[PDB]
Design a protein around this ligand. Structure first.
Ligand SMILES: CCCCCCCC/C=C/CCCCCCCC(=O)O[C@@H](COC(=O)CCCCCCCCCCCCCCC)COP(=O)([O-])OCC[N+](C)(C)C
Ligand SMILES: CCCCCCCC/C=C/CCCCCCCC(=O)O[C@@H](COC(=O)CCCCCCCCCCCCCCC)COP(=O)([O-])OCC[N+](C)(C)C
Ligand SMILES: CCCCCCCC/C=C/CCCCCCCC(=O)O[C@@H](COC(=O)CCCCCCCCCCCCCCC)COP(=O)([O-])OCC[N+](C)(C)C
Ligand SMILES: CCCCCCCC/C=C/CCCCCCCC(=O)O[C@@H](COC(=O)CCCCCCCCCCCCCCC)COP(=O)([O-])OCC[N+](C)(C)C
Ligand SMILES: CCCCCCCC/C=C/CCCCCCCC(=O)O[C@@H](COC(=O)CCCCCCCCCCCCCCC)COP(=O)([O-])OCC[N+](C)(C)C
Ligand SMILES: CCCCCCCC/C=C/CCCCCCCC(=O)O[C@@H](COC(=O)CCCCCCCCCCCCCCC)COP(=O)([O-])OCC[N+](C)(C)C
Ligand SMILES: CCCCCCCC/C=C\CCCCCCCC(=O)O[C@@H](COC(=O)CCCCCCCCCCCCCCC)COP(=O)([O-])OCC[N+](C)(C)C
Ligand SMILES: CCCCCCCC/C=C\CCCCCCCC(=O)O[C@@H](COC(=O)CCCCCCCCCCCCCCC)COP(=O)([O-])OCC[N+](C)(C)C
Ligand SMILES: C[C@@H]1CC[C@@]2(OC1)O[C@H]1C[C@H]3[C@@H]4CC=C5C[C@@H](OCCC(CO)CO)CC[C@]5(C)[C@H]4CC[C@]3(C)[C@H]1[C@@H]2C
Ligand SMILES: C[C@@H]1CC[C@@]2(OC1)O[C@H]1C[C@H]3[C@@H]4CC=C5C[C@@H](OCCC(CO)CO)CC[C@]5(C)[C@H]4CC[C@]3(C)[C@H]1[C@@H]2C
Ligand SMILES: [Ca+2]
Lengths: 92, 92
């Protein structure tokens, strides 16, 4: 689950925040929103940052249209496959 | 699951946005919110667009009272039946 989390967190941050210098905030940002997604928080108005109803309009930029596709795959794998594998283990 | 998604996405967009010219945004709009519903985002303040607490007051129009009924059926089929069928397959 942690590897799946980082496989999404790292590209999301890199695509959406391409002007960053090194900081320990990078560590937080690559884990934080992806973890809360496990529990069904999709951050609906942050998904497409170039939409009119976006709460992150300044983040709109080149390549940012990729991250909804990434998040679509992430939740399918994380929220549906991996959480229910863990639940299947707990059921045994 | 994809057919169920489009069976809801297409009427929702058509009823709520009846003045559209052809664009590739139509493709996004018929899939986007219906996909995030799979994961429990109901878009609560967008459901009834003619309500006082609606975040889409300009969308209020003829026939827009239909879309809460459509979304009620969609989530029951998608969120409850189809996701748990997929989970049942994963459990096997
Ligand atoms: C540096 C960061 C990466 C590593 C993660 C460190 C954190 C902790 C997690 C650790 C997870 C790995 C645990 C196994 C390795 C420890 C020893 C072990 O048991 O080895 C086994 C092989 O080991 C492998 O095959 C491991 C291969 C490396 C995996 C690296 C990615 C994992 C993290 C993914 C990224 C997300 C999570 C992390 C967040 C980034 C062999 O063991 P054994 O003793 O021969 O067998 C025991 C049974 N016996 C008694 C019968 C013999
Ligand atoms: C998992 C993948 C990510 C990368 C992995 C590598 C690890 C990365 C490690 C990073 C920690 C090392 C860098 C410390 C820098 C802290 C500076 C700072 O602003 O601190 C902030 C918080 O933090 C603290 O106050 C102290 C640090 C606590 C959090 C880290 C615990 C370790 C993670 C546990 C697991 C072990 C980790 C090991 C690996 C799993 C203080 O600022 P603020 O809270 O924003 O605001 C407070 C109020 N203020 C605004 C007035 C200030
Ligand atoms: C997959 C990884 C798991 C590995 C093990 C555990 C790893 C633990 C976590 C590692 C990530 C980094 C830890 C924090 C330190 C870096 C941030 C920092 O220094 O400061 C930041 C604050 O930081 C906080 O306030 C701390 C909150 C951290 C997230 C904890 C919840 C998510 C848990 C996820 C668990 C995933 C478990 C996965 C299982 C499925 C920012 O402060 P600053 O730097 O001053 O910046 C200025 C900010 N300011 C101006 C707004 C004030
Ligand atoms: C059933 C369907 C799946 C079929 C296969 C996969 C199909 C993949 C999906 C296809 C839908 C359409 C793809 C995008 C291209 C059209 C939109 C476009 O051109 O621009 C739009 C942006 O578009 C984006 O920012 C891209 C985000 C698309 C949504 C991805 C997540 C949903 C995943 C769903 C996955 C469902 C999986 C179902 C499984 C249950 C709008 O930009 P514009 O046109 O310039 O308009 C101006 C807007 N502006 C002024 C605000 C800037
Ligand atoms: C153009 C868009 C619609 C099509 C979708 C294309 C996308 C991809 C999805 C494709 C899903 C369909 C896969 C099956 C068809 C491929 C070949 C096949 O296996 O045929 C089978 C019959 O095939 C049918 O009965 C298909 C009937 C058409 C379904 C059209 C709607 C599906 C998409 C709904 C809309 C939502 C999803 C899409 C997003 C809009 C017979 O196969 P066979 O080889 O005889 O049997 C193999 C076993 N053997 C080796 C023992 C013999
Ligand atoms: C699934 C059911 C729906 C219909 C399906 C039919 C296919 C529909 C296909 C549509 C794509 C083909 C037409 C191109 C339109 C792009 C114009 C545009 O606005 O681009 C936008 C994004 O998009 C891009 O930048 C390029 C397109 C990438 C996303 C779509 C990939 C295909 C979906 C994958 C799966 C295969 C699909 C095949 C079938 C499954 C750029 O604009 P923005 O992001 O809004 O804003 C960014 C900032 N700006 C404002 C400064 C610009
Ligand atoms: C094995 C297959 C290999 C792939 C082959 C296909 C290759 C790709 C084919 C089609 C993708 C669509 C074309 C790209 C988008 C066009 C728009 C553009 O040029 O500018 C975009 C960025 O600038 C770029 O140059 C983006 C280039 C994308 C990199 C390649 C993506 C690969 C996708 C992975 C492949 C997965 C395939 C599907 C798997 C399920 C947007 O710019 P803007 O937003 O307008 O700028 C903001 C302006 N502002 C700052 C003022 C706000
Ligand atoms: C096979 C079974 C047979 C079906 C029999 C039942 C048939 C239905 C019987 C009754 C439905 C209720 C009556 C219609 C709505 C009343 C309001 C009205 O007249 O105006 C409406 C539009 O104008 C219309 O003419 C809407 C007509 C709806 C099409 C028919 C619906 C079929 C439902 C499917 C049947 C499923 C049955 C249940 C299944 C579980 C609203 O106008 P407004 O919003 O005031 O305008 C906005 C003004 N503004 C722009 C300034 C903001
Ligand atoms: C198997 C996994 C692959 C992914 C991964 O784990 C293992 O690989 C690790 C590499 C880490 C970075 C290494 C170096 C730094 C520089 C530091 O800079 C000082 C601070 C500054 C403040 O201003 C001084 O002034 C900031 C932190 C950063 C960017 C790390 C972040 C976490 C990263 C990306 C980790 C990530 C989760
Ligand atoms: C089995 C499934 C039934 C549903 C469905 O899949 C198969 O059937 C497909 C038909 C598609 C549309 C066909 C033609 C166009 C015109 C184009 O116009 C140029 C743009 C303009 C920009 O300004 C040029 O300048 C825009 C796209 C649009 C409306 C398609 C959208 C997706 C649709 C609705 C698809 C939908 C998901
Ligand atoms: Ca939920």
């Amino acid at each position: 689950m942690a590897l799946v989390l980082l496989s999404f967190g790292v590209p999301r941050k890199a695509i959406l925040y391409p002007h960053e210098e090194p900081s320990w905030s990078l560590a937080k940002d690559i884990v934080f929103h992806p973890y809360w997604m496990i529990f069904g928080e999709v951050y609906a108005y942050e998904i497409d940052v170039c939409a009119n109803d976006s709460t992150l309009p300044t983040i709109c930029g080149p390549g940012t249209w990729l991250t909804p596709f990434l998040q679509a795959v992430y939740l399918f794998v994380q929220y549906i496959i991996m959480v229910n594998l863990l639940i299947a283990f707990f059921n045994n």
